[PDB]
Each structure stands twice: as C-alpha cells, then as structure tokens.
Amino acid sequence: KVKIAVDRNPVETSFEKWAKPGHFSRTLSKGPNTTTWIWNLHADAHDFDSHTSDLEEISRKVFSAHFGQLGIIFIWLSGMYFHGARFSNYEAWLSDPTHIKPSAQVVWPIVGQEILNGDVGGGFQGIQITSGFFQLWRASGITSELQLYTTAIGGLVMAAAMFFAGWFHYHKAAPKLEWFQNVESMLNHHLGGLLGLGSLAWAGHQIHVSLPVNKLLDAGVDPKEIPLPHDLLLNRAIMADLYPSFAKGIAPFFTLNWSEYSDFLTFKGGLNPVTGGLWLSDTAHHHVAIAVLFLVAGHMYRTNWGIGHSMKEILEAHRGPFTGEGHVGLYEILTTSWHAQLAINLALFGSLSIIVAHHMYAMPPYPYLATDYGTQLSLFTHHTWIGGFCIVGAGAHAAIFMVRDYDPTNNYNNLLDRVIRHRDAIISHLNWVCIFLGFHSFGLYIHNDTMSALGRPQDMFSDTAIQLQPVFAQWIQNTHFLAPQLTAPNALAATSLTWGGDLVAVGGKVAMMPISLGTSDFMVHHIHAFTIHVTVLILLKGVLFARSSRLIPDKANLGFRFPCDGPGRGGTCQVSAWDHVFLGLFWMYNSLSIVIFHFSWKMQSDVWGTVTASGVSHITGGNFAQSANTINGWLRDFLWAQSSQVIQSYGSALSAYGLIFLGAHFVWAFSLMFLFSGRGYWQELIESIVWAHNKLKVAPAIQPRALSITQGRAVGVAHYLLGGIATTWSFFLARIISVG
C-alpha cells in the first residue's frame, strides 16, 4: 500500500552537536590528535553511508540535504533577480538590446578597482555579464525592475520554505524507509506533476504573458506603454486584438477545434527575424505538447489500484537467450542503494547538460541571445563542463556501489554478474579501440604538421589536398534542411539554420547561418571520439575492477578510496576505483577542453561575424578550414592569435580577465607540486620545521602531518582543473567580449 509514513520528533533540535566537531563519526568523535583529523572531518561530512549502516537514517539525511541544496539554489536565483532590479541596466537594454551590453554587477570604488565598471551603455557602468539572464527575463516578458525585485523576494520566501522543509522532514516528521522505497509512486508524480504540470503551467505564463508582451516588444512598442501582464490576463479583448482566436475563449479546446488556436500555437521553426531567437508561439505549442506527453507518462506505474505497471515485473519479464537471468535483481539494487541511483542519475543528467549546450546554440531559444556571442560562448562552455563533471561522478558512484552495495547472493548469472565475468574481454577490446582512434585521429594531425614543415602541402589531409569529408553528417544536414517540404510537411522552416538555408541577421551581426563540415571538422570529431572512448576506458575499468583484479584479489576489502596495496607485486600505486576517477577527471578535462576550443574557433571562424553590404565578414575570416588541420595551426591561429585580448586587457575593464588568466596559469602549475610529489618527502620536511617550533616552544598540540596520499591526489586534480578551466574561462570571456 503506497502511503505517507513518518516518525514524529525523531531528532532533537539542539546546538549540542554543533559544538562537538566530528560527532557523526565513530572514529572522528574522539577529537583531533593530528592535523589529519581536520581533513577527515570535512572529507567524511556528507558520506552518510559511512556514518551509519541504517538505510532509513541515511535516506532521511539525503532528503534533508536535498532541501538544503534547494534552499541554496533559491538564494542564488533571488540574488540574480535582485542584482537585475537594483544593480543592472536591464530597463535601458530592453529599449536598445542591439547596442547596450548586459551588466548586473557593480564594484565599489576602492584600491582603484572601479576600473572594472566598464561603459556597458545605457548610462550605466558595471561588469558585463554573460549568464543570459537579460534575454531570459525579456523572453519571460519582464519589463520593469519592480518585477525582478518581486521575484527576488519570492525566491527568498521559497529559500526560507526549503530550509524549513529540510529541518521539518528531519527533526519533526521524518519519512520512513518504506515511504522512500515507493519508486512507482515517485516516478508517477515526477513525470506527471513536476514535469508535466510544470510544462503546462509554463505554457500558461507564455500564452498569457510571454507571447503578447514579446509581440508588442517586437512590434516596436515602448516597454512603458505595454499592458501589464494582469491587464492581459483579465482582459480578453486586448489578447483578441493581438491573437484573434482569443475572442473564442477556451470553447475550441473542449470542442476539439484546436486549429483555431493556430495563431499562438504554431510550428514555424527557424528563428524570429527581429530578435534572432526561436518563435515563442513555437515554444508555447512545444511546452503544451511536453505537458500532455508527461501527464500521460505519469499514469504508467501501479500505485494503490490494480491499473498500472510493476517495474519489478517489467524487468523480470525482459530476459533473452544470451543474457542468462537478465534484469533480475536490478529492482532490489535500485531501491536499496542510493549510490546506484546516483550513478545512473549523474550519467543521464550530465549527458543532458551537454545536449542542452548544442541545442541552445544551434536553436537559440531567447530573444537577442544569438548575437550576444559572449553569452552564447559562455552558456555552451558552462553547460558542457557541468555535463562532463557529472559524467565522471556517475563513474565514481557506480564504483562505490560495486564496492559497498554489491552482493553476489542477489546477483548470480544476472546481467551485472555476466558483465563482471567478461570484464577482461570488455577492457581489452576497448583498449584496442582507444589505440586505433588515437593513431587514426591525432596521427593525422602529426602527418599534416610534418608534411607542412617539410614543404609538402599537397601530401596533407585538407579540403584542397587529400580530403576526409564527413559525408554522413553532410547527408543528415541536407535531410534535416529539406525536411519541411517532405518528411515534416506542416513545419514552415527547418529546426535550425545550421542544417542550411538562408542566414538570419540581427543588429548587423549573424544570429545563425549554415555550418559547413569539411576535413578539419571530420578530424576534430574523431579527436572527440578518441578522448571520450579513452575517458570511458579509465572510468569503466575502475568500476569493473573495483572489487578485484588479477593483480589484487581483495581490492573490495581495501575499499573504494585507498592509496595502494604497497610496493609489492612490482608496485600497486593507484589501483583503487577512486584513483580511476582521479585519472578520469584529467581525460574528461582534456576531452571537453578540446570540445569547447573546437566550438569557439568554428563559431568565430564560420558563423559569428558582422553582416555588411553584399558579404558576411566572420571574426577569424574563415581560417578554421585551412588552419585547424595541424597542431601548429591550432597553437598559432587559435591560442597565440586569440590570446591578444586577454594579454592586452590591462588598463581596461577586462583587466580582471588578464589577472585571472595569470592567476589560473599559477593554480595549474601549483597543482603539479602535489601531483608529482609524495607525502614521504613532505612529512620529513615538516619534522625539521616542527623541530624549530619545538625549540622556540611554539609547537602545536595537534601534530602537523603531511596530507594523506589520497588527499595529495585530490588536492592536485582540484587545482589542475581549477587552474586549467579558469585559464580558458579568462581567455574566452576577454576574447569574446572584445570582438563580440
């Protein structure tokens, strides 16, 4: 029986534990004797599984920790809306979006930092933002700082509610395990309520506020004289003037005469010529369809009535002759293991964040987002990085489950067991695939570099020399482009201009145009295949060999996070699944660094650019095709040439990017100290320093200790990614804001 079950007053609300650091751990509650305790306290703070073996207690901690996260996110959103209402040029940008640069951060005049308040326009001075909030607020139909201020207050009321919910559902009415194990009910509400209702509600706001307000904005009506959203919500005659079908009311909906609502529910495709963004009428009909689809999907799982499906039955039913027992045991694993759920959820959520980056750039959904190159580059790169991090996390929690929640008694001859029984076949085959990709992807760049250096350009792989055209991607582009006339008859235009056709220009800048794919594109798509395949190789290997290997047969007893098994067997350094995540992070960074560099150069070379009389001039003059086929071409025409903006930012508002560019190169080099060294050397050096403190009677009771081996690796990778990603960040923002 699916039902609400909770325990009353489970945990007392006192500050007694606040004053006892490490209270959650049996080992840490004893207090610190060495400095390692401090790190251990912070490193083991959110590892509930290691805190207690009670699943119900762990589940209650997870639920309340999520309410804490939701409260944090709400404060963040309220700040963005507040800074848009009190520290921004949004109202001026609404009147002149093609010239005024969005800005919502103003710095105090101190130690000379006021230089960072650049002349963004609109009689305003501040730091130029690239989050895309101005375009989102314009799409939503916000026309006043009063609306931004009111939403900010709402977000804080919501943040207070989230933090209350967290305290209430942990200290007052804590849900029991049975409650959390209602997966069938959870999916029905998240698909039908959260997703379908959320999409339906948003369609309501778009149809009654976003569409009329933005139609008036695009018609040239001043933001001051546009009717307030409520005026449109309480008057049908105004909405009827803008959309004739509103004069008929909701009769057409219940009479199945949906065709009447064709003026606001449309399938135009392409881009609004005025703004360069997708038609809001298309986004409205889309969210309405999404809402219907997800409302149906949320009525599939069985709850308290006979109708519906049982996920355990469906799984147990899907079994074939080549996979033994099949999906048996998965329902039990995915209803008793949070690490198993986190592994699958992180994998899909990261893959999704990466899909959002591609879809949002090719089909720019917000008005005036396409021609804001700083925002476009920032959005794509940001969501690409978030996706990659989440994908690596998916790997770690899959290994944590394999090490802590895997039970063979429940996994005999099932898909999981059969995968572990042919792990050597899988890793060895993937190993060869990685080596083949490496030589046939990066070897082509070396060939071109050598042929160019040897003065033999005709022997290079290029659109003029030997050609490696991506025919399949060229055919798909042609198919999607011609789709409107045959396979998608109702659609007026193709989904994106990238496929082909005419270019859309707003403010004299190219919003979107067809993107051609040649030998240089074919070469960089195969570098992506190689980098992703290799990253998977490290993460997968770490998960499949987490419990044991031919080198170490009791790795599972050693745990998920352990430095090694000693110098024996030749040396067992970095055999733990955690160490595979450590190595996977570097390859994920290498892959995504190459992906974002590819996007920036391709967009600056073949898409972005000012549209003039009879001709479009791109930012880099179309040099990607003949300069991205060699490593020298990448180093010279991309890194060296586009670094001019960041290296010459001193004395201006982008001066901060120059400082961060140097600071980031520093943090990255500082990581190498931790990544190349070992704690044995540092411990001894500390011993001589401790001697000086002992000599002057200034030695601390908490014994100073070198970082643990695992901590040394964790500190190194953190500073490596921080430094490397920040360096690209400063380079990208300075370059785009200057030549945007």
Partner: protein, 144 residues
C-alpha cells in the same frame, strides 16, 4: 594430523566461467588448487570476479597464484566459518601442500614450528651499510 593428498576429481562449485581464470602459466609453470568442505550450498564471490555456488560437502577450485587461493581462504573462514586448504600443482603431476602447512593456521602458535628470518636484536642495532660493502653482492645490514 598428516599431510593431505589432493583428490583432483573433486566436484567444483557451480560457476559459468569468467575471463579472469587460469592462463598459459598453469600449463607451463604451476597453478594452485583450493579445497574445502561445505555443510550447505551457499553462493560466494570468486576472487577472479563473479558469483558461484559452493556444493554440499567437498569443493575444489584452481587459481593462477597463491594470493587468489588465500583470498578465497579468507572469505570462506571469516564469512562461512569453513576451514579450506590449498596446494601448488606443477605441470609434471607433482602436488605440494601449502596451507595450513602444519594443519594449524599460522596465526595460532603451534609447537614444532621452528623460527626463521628472526634477528635477536632491534632494528636500531643494525650495522652501517659501509660494513656490508664489497660483499658477494648488493646486501642490507639487516641480512647479516
């Protein structure tokens, strides 16, 4: 207690096989064979990866190295309270009993066992390397 004789025709736990099993070394150099008695059919974890069902009474498995046999020996003793024994088998038919060497597990002190590699001194009483220099080969002051 007497040195046990390995019966090579013992029933092996139910297992569909894996890719972490024996390699060419088993046919050219040597392999290891663990044997134990089970009072009930229980699924257990193969140190080479995968789940397997131990059979009622006698059970026999072959591993590539001694560490894998001792790893399974640890699981059976700690989790199922069983008492397994393993042997090293050469490709010429020779069998060598290995653990427990005297029938009493090493951690339990047993008579007859003669101390080996024991130094009647503390590590801080070792000589300086200069004293053990120019000996037959590279050696440590500890070896003397």
């Amino acid at each position: 207690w007497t040195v046990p004789t390995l019966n090579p025709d013992t029933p092996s736990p139910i297992f569909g096989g894996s890719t972490g099993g024996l390699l060419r070394k088993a046919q050219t150099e040597e392999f290891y064979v663990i044997t134990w008695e089970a009072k009930k059919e229980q699924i257990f974890e193969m140190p080479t990866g995968g789940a397997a069902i131990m059979r009622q009474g006698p059970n026999l498995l072959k591993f590539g190295k001694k560490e894998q046999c001792l790893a399974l020996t640890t699981q059976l003793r700690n989790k199922f309270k069983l008492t397994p024994c393993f042997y090293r088998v050469f490709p010429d038919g020779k069998v060598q009993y290995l653990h427990p060497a005297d029938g009493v597990y090493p951690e339990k002190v047993n008579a007859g066992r003669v101390g080996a590699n024991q130094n009647m001194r503390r590590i801080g009483q070792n000589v300086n390397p200069i004293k053990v220099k120019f000996s037959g080969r590279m050696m440590s002051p500890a070896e003397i």
